[PDB]
Structure formats: structure tokens, C-alpha cells
Chain A
């Protein structure tokens, strides 16, 4: 995509913009409490750690 001006004229500061997406495929792991209980597959998953570490690497 573009970011404003994009005419191709040898001198016009051709501006560009590429939109890409980064997808994590992570495995959810249920917790077991011995007493005979479990956590469903639809429980909350801590992504905040993932965003944190990804952003630190980018910075």
C-alpha cells in the first residue's frame, strides 16, 4: 500500500507502506488439580507476556 504520495517520477519521494500480520500458533495446556478437576479448553490465555516480549525484541 501507499502512505501518501506514490507517483513514479524519478524524484517525488515515493512513499510506501506494507501491511503484514504475525500470527502465533501456541498450544493451550489445561491444568489438573488431582482432586479430579480440570480447566476447560475455553479458559483465558495469557497473551500479554507474548506481546510484551515481542515488543521488547522489536524495540
Chain B
């Protein structure tokens, strides 16, 4: 296993952790329709699928 071999890898992992944290910070104080996901017009809401979407988007960006 060679992922965490170079110290640089470790430091990069830290830099990515803090960035991911500050990113996820946007997902605070909103709804999470998780049974009948039909988020109504004019409400600040989301569902797990849209979350996964945005996460994958961020990830694929920072590549």
C-alpha cells in the first residue's frame, strides 16, 4: 500500500479535509425530503440524491 507513504500525501489529505469541511458547511439549515422527494416550489430543500450529485460534482472538479 502506497497511498500514505509520502508525507506530502498526508499534508494533501489534510488540505483536502479542511476544504471538504468548508464545502459541506453550505449544507446546513435546510430540509431533506427523503420519502416523497417532490421539493415544493419556493422552499430551500434537498434530497439525498441531489446531495450525492453535488458531492460528485465538487470531487470531479477538484481532481
Contacts and interface: CB of A to CB of B under 8 A. Distances in A.
B38 interface: yes
Interface of A: 10-11
Interface in B4-51: 38, 40-41
Nearest to B36: A10
Contacts, number: 5
Contacts of A11: 38, 40-41
A48 to B, nearest CB: 45
| 5 closest Cβ pairs, A-B complex | A10-B38, A11-B41, A11-B38, A11-B40, A10-B40
A27 to B, nearest CB: 51
Nearest to A11: B41
Contacts of B41: 11
A33 B28 CA distance: 87
5 contacts: A10-B38, A10-B40, A11-B38, A11-B40, A11-B41
A17 B41 CA distance: 22
A59 to B, nearest CB: 31
